[PDB]
PDB file of C-alpha atoms and ligand atoms in Angstrom:
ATOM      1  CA  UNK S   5       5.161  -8.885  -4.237  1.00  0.00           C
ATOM      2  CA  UNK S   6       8.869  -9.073  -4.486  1.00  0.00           C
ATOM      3  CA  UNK S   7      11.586 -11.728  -2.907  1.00  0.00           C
ATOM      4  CA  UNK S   8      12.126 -10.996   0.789  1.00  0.00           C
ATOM      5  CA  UNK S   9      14.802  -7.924   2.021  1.00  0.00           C
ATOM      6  CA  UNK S  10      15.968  -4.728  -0.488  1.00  0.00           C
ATOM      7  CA  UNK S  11      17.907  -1.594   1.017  1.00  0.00           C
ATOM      8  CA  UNK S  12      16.897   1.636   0.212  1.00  0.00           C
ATOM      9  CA  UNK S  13      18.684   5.389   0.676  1.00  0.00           C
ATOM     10  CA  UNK S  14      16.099   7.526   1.452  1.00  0.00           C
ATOM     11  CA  UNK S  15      17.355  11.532   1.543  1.00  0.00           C
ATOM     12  CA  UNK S  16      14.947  14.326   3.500  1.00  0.00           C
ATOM     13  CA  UNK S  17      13.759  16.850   1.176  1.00  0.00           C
ATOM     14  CA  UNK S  18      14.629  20.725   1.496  1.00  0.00           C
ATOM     15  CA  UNK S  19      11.876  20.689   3.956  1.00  0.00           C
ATOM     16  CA  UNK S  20      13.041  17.992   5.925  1.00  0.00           C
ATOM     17  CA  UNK S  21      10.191  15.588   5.169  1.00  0.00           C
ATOM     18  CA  UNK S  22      10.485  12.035   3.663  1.00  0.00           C
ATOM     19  CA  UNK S  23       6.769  11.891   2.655  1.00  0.00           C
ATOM     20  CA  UNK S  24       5.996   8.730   4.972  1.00  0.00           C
ATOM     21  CA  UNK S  25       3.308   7.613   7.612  1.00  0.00           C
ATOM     22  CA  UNK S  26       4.509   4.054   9.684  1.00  0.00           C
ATOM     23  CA  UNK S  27       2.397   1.579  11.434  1.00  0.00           C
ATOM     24  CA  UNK S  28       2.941  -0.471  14.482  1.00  0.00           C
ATOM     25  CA  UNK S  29       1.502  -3.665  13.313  1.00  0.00           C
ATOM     26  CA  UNK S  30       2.130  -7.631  15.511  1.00  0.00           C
ATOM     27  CA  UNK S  31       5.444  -6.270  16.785  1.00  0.00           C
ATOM     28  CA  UNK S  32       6.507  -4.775  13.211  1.00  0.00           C
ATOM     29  CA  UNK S  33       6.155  -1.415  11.301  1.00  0.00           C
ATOM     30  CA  UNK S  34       4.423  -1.094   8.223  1.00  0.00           C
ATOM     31  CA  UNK S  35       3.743   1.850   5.609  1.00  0.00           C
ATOM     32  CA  UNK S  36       0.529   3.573   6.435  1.00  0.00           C
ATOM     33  CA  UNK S  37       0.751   6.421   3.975  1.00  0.00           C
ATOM     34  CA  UNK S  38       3.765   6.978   0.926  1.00  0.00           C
ATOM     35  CA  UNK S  39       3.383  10.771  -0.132  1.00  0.00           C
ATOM     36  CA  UNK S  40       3.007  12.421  -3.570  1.00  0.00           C
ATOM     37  CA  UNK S  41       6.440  13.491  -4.624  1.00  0.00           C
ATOM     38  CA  UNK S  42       8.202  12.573  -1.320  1.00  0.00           C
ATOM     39  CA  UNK S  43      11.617  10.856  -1.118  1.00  0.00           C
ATOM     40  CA  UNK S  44       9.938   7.951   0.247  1.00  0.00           C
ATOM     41  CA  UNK S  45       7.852   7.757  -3.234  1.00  0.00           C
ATOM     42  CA  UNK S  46      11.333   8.218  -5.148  1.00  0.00           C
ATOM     43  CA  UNK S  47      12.153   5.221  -3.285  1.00  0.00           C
ATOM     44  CA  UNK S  48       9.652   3.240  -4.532  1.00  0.00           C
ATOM     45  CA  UNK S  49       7.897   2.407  -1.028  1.00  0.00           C
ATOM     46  CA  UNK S  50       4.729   1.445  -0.866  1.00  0.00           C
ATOM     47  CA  UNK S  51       1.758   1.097   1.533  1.00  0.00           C
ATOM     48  CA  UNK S  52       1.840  -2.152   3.209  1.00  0.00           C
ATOM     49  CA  UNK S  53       5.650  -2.563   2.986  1.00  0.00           C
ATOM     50  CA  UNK S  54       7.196  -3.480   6.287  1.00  0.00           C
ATOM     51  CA  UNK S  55      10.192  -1.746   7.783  1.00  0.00           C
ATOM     52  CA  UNK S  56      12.704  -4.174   9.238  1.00  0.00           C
ATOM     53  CA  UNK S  57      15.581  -1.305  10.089  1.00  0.00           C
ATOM     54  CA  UNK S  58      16.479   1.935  10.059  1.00  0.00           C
ATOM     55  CA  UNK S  59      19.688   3.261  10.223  1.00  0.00           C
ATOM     56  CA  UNK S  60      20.892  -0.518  10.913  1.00  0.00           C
ATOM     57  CA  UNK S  61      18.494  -0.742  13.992  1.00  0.00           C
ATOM     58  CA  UNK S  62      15.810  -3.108  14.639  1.00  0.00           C
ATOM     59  CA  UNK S  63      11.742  -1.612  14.203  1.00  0.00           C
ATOM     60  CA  UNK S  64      10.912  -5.229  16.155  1.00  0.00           C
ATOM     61  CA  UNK S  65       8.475  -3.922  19.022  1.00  0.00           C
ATOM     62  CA  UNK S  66       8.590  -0.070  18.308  1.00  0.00           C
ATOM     63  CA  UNK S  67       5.323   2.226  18.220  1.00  0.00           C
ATOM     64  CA  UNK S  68       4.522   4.218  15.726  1.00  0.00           C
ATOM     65  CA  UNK S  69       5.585   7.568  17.780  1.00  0.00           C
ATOM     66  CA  UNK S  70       9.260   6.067  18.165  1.00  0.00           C
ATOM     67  CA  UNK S  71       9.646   5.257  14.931  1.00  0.00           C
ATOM     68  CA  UNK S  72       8.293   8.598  13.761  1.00  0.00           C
ATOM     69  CA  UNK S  73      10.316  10.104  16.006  1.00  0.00           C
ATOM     70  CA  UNK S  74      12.920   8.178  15.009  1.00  0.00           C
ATOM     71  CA  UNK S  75      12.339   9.242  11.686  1.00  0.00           C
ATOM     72  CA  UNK S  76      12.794  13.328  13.210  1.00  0.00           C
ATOM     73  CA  UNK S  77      15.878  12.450  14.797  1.00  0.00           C
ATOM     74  CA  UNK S  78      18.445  11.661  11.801  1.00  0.00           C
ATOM     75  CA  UNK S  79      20.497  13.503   9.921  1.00  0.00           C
ATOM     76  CA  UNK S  80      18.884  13.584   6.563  1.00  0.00           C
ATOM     77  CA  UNK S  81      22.256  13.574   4.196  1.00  0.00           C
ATOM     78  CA  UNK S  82      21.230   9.260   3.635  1.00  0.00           C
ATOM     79  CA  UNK S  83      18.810   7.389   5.897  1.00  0.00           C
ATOM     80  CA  UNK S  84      18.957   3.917   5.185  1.00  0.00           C
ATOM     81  CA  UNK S  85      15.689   1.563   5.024  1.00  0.00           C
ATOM     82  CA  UNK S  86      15.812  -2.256   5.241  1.00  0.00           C
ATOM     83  CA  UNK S  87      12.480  -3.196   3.248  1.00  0.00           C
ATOM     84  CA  UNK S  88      10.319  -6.185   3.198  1.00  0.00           C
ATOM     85  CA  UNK S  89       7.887  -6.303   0.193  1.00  0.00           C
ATOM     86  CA  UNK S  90       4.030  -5.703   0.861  1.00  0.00           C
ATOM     87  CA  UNK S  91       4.427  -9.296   3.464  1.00  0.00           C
ATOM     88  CA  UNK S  92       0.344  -8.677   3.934  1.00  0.00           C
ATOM     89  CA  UNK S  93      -0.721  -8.372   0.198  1.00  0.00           C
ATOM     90  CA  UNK S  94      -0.881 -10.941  -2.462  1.00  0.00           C
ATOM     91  CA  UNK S  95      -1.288 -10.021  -6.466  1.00  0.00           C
ATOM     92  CA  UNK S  96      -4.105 -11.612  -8.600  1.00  0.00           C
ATOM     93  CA  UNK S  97      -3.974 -11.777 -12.433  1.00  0.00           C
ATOM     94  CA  UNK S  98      -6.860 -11.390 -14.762  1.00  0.00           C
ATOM     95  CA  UNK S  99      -8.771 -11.057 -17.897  1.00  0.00           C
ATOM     96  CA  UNK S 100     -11.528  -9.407 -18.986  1.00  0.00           C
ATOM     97  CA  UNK S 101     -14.245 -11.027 -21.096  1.00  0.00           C
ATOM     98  CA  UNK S 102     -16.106  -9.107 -24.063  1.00  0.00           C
ATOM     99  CA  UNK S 103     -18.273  -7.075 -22.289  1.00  0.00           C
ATOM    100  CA  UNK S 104     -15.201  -5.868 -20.153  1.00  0.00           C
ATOM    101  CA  UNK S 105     -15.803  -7.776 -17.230  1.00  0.00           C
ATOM    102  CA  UNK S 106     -13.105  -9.332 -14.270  1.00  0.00           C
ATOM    103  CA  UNK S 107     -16.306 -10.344 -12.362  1.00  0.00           C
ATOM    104  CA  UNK S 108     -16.662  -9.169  -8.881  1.00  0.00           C
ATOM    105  CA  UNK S 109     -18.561  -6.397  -7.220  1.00  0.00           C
ATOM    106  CA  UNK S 110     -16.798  -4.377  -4.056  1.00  0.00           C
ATOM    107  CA  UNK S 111     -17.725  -1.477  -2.094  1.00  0.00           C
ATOM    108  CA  UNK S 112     -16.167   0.871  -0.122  1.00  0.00           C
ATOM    109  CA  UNK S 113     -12.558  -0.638  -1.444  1.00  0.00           C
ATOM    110  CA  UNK S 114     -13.605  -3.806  -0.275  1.00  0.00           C
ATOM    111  CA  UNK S 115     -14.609  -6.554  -2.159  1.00  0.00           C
ATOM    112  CA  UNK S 116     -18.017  -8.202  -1.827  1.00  0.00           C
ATOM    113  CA  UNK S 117     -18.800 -11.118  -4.098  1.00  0.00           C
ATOM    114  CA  UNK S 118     -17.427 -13.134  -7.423  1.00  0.00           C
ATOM    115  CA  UNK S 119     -19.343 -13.382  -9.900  1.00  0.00           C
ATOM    116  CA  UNK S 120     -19.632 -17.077 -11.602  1.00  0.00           C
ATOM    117  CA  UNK S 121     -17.669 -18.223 -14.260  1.00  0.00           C
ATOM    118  CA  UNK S 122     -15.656 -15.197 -14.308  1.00  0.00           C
ATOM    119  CA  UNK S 123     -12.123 -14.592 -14.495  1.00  0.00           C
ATOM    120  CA  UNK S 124     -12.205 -13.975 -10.809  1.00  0.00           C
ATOM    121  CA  UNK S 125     -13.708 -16.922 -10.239  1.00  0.00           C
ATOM    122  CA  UNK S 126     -10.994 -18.339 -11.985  1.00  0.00           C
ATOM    123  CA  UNK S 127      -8.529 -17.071 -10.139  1.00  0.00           C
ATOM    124  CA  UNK S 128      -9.410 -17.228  -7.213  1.00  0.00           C
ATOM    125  CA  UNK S 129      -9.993 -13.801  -5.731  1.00  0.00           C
ATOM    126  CA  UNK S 130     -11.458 -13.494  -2.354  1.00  0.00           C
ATOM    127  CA  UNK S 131     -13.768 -11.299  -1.061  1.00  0.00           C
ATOM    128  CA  UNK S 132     -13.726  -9.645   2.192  1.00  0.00           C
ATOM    129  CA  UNK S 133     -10.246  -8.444   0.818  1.00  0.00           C
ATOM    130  CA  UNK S 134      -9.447  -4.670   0.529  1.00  0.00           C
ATOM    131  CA  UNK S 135      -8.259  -3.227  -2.810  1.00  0.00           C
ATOM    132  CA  UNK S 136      -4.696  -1.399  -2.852  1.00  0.00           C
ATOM    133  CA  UNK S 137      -3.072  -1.332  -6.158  1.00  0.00           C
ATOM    134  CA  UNK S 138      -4.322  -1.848  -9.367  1.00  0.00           C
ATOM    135  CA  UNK S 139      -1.663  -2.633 -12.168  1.00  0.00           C
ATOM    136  CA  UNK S 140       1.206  -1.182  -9.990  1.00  0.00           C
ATOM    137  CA  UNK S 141      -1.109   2.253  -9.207  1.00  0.00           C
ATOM    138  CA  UNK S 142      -2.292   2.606  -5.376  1.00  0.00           C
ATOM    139  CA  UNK S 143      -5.946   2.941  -4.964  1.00  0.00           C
ATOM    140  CA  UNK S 144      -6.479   3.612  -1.638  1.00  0.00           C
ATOM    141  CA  UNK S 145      -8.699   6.521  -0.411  1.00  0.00           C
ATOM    142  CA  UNK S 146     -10.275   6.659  -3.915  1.00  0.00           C
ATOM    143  CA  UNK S 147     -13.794   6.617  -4.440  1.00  0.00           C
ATOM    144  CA  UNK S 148     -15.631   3.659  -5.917  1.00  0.00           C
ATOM    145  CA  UNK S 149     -16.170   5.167  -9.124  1.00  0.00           C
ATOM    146  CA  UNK S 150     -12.831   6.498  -9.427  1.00  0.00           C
ATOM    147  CA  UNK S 151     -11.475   2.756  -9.098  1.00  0.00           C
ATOM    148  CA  UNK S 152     -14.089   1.750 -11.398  1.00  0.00           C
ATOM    149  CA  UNK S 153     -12.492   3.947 -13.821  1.00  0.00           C
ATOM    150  CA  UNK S 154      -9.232   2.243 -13.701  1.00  0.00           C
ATOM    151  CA  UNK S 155     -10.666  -0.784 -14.224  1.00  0.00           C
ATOM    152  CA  UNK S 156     -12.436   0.320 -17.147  1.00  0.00           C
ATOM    153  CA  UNK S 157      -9.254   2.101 -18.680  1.00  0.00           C
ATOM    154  CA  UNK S 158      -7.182  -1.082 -17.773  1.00  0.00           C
ATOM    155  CA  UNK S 159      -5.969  -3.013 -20.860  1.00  0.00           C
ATOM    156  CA  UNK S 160      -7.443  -6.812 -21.024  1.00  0.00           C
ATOM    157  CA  UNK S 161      -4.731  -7.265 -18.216  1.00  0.00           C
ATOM    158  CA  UNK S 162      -6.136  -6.416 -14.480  1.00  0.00           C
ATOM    159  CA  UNK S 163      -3.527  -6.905 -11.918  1.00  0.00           C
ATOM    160  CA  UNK S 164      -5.213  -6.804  -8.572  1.00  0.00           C
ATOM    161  CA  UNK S 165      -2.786  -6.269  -4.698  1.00  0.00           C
ATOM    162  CA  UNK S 166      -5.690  -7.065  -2.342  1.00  0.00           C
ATOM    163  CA  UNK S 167      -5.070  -7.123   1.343  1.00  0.00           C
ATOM    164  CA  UNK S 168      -7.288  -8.594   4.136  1.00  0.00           C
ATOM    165  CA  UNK S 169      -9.918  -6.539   5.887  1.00  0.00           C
ATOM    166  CA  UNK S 170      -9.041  -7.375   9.079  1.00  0.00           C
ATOM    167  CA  UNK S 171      -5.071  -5.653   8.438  1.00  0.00           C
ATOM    168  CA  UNK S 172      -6.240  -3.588   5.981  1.00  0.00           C
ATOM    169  CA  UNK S 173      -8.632  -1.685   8.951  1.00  0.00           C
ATOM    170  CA  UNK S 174      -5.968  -2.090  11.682  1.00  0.00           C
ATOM    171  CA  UNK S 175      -3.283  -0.390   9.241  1.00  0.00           C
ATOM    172  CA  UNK S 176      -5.191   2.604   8.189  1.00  0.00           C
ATOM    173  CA  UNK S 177      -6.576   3.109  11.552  1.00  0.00           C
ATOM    174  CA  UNK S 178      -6.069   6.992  12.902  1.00  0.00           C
ATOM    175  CA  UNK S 179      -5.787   7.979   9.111  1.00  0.00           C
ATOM    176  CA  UNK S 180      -8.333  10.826   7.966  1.00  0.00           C
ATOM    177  CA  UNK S 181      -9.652   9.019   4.962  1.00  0.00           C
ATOM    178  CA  UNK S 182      -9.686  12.775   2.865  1.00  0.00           C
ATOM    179  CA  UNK S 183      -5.222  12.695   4.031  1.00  0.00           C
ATOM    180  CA  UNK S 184      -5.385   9.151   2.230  1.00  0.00           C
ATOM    181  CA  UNK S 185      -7.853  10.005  -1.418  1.00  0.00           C
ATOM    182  CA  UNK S 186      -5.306  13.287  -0.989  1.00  0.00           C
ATOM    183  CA  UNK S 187      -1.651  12.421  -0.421  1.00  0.00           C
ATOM    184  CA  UNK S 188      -1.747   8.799  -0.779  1.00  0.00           C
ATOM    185  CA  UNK S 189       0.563   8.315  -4.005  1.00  0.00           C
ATOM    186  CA  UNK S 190      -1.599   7.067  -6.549  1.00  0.00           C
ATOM    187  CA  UNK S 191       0.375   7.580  -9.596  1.00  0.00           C
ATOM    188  CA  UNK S 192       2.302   4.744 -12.197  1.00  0.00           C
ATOM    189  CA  UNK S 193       6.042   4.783 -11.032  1.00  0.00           C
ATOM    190  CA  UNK S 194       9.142   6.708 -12.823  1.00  0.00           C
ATOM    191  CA  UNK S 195      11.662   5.463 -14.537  1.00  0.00           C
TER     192      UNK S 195
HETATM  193  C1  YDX Y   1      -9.665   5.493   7.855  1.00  0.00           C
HETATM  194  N1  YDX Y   1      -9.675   5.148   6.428  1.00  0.00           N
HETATM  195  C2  YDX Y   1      -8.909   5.659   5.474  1.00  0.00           C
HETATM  196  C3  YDX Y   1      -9.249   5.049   4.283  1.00  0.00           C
HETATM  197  C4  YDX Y   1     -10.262   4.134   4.549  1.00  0.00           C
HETATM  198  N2  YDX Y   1     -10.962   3.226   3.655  1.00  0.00           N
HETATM  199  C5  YDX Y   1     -10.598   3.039   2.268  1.00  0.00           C
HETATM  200  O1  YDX Y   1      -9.709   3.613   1.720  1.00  0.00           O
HETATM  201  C6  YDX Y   1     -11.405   2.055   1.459  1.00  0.00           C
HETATM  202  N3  YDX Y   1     -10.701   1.798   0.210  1.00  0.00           N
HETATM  203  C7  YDX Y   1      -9.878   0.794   0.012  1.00  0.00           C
HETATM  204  C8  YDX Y   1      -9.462   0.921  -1.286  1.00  0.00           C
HETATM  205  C9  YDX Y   1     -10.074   2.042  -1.856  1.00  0.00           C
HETATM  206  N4  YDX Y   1     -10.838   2.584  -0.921  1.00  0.00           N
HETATM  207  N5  YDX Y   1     -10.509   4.203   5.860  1.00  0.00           N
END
């Protein structure tokens, strides 16, 4: 989670498409769903990230519809984004022990207990928190197992973006959860 405000240029694609879902959330608009191969992926937006302006104007107060139809209506030669940095996610740091542990259980995404004297423990993770990224790779919409996987083919280094429950459901609300384990980025960044 990054300091405060970056710009971005985002540029429709040949099919006019940007690749991104947006969320009225408390009087701002948040990233609901970043696409595969999308401009908005290019980019480097991520779920969770609020959108302060576009094209210089204000999201404050808009609904999703306006600001997808805002979206529609502009001319797709250089939209410009003004960015805060996942503002409802925090990262945790840990380490594994021996057996190749961070020590929690979730399901469902969502976090469910520590596990004592873990690394988690440690560190302080909280349960009741839904997982989005692990080590800079978004995990929503994956399956249990499949997130178990990237744990298990994570170095000794788990970095962990959880998000509250409570936003976490209000974001993704009126996403088909198939649209998120499909479309939903969920690959390392380019360089
Ligand atoms: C409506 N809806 C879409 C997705 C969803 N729930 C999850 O994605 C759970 N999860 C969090 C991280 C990994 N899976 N509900």
């Amino acid at each position: 989670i990054k300091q405060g405000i970056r710009e971005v240029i985002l540029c429709k694609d040949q099919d006019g498409k940007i690749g991104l879902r947006l969320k009225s959330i408390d009087n701002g608009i948040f990233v609901q769903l970043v696409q595969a191969n999308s401009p908005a992926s290019l980019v480097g937006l991520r779920f969770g990230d609020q959108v302060l302006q576009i094209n210089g104007e204000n999201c404050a107060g808009w609904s999703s519809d306006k600001a997808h139809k805002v979206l529609k209506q502009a001319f797709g030669e250089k939209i410009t984004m003004t960015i805060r940095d996942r503002p409802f996610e925090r990262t945790i740091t840990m380490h594994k022990d021996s057996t190749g542990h961070v020590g929690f259980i979730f399901k469902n995404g969502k976090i469910t207990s520590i596990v004592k004297d873990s690394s988690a423990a440690r560190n302080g993770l909280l349960t009741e928190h839904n997982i989005c990224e692990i080590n800079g790779q978004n995990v929503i919409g994956l399956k249990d197992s499949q997130i178990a996987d990237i744990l298990s083919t994570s170095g000794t280094v788990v970095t962990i973006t959880i998000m509250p429950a409570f936003i976490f459901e209000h974001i993704i609300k009126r996403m088909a959860p198939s649209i998120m384990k499909s479309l939903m980025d969920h690959t390392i960044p380019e360089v």
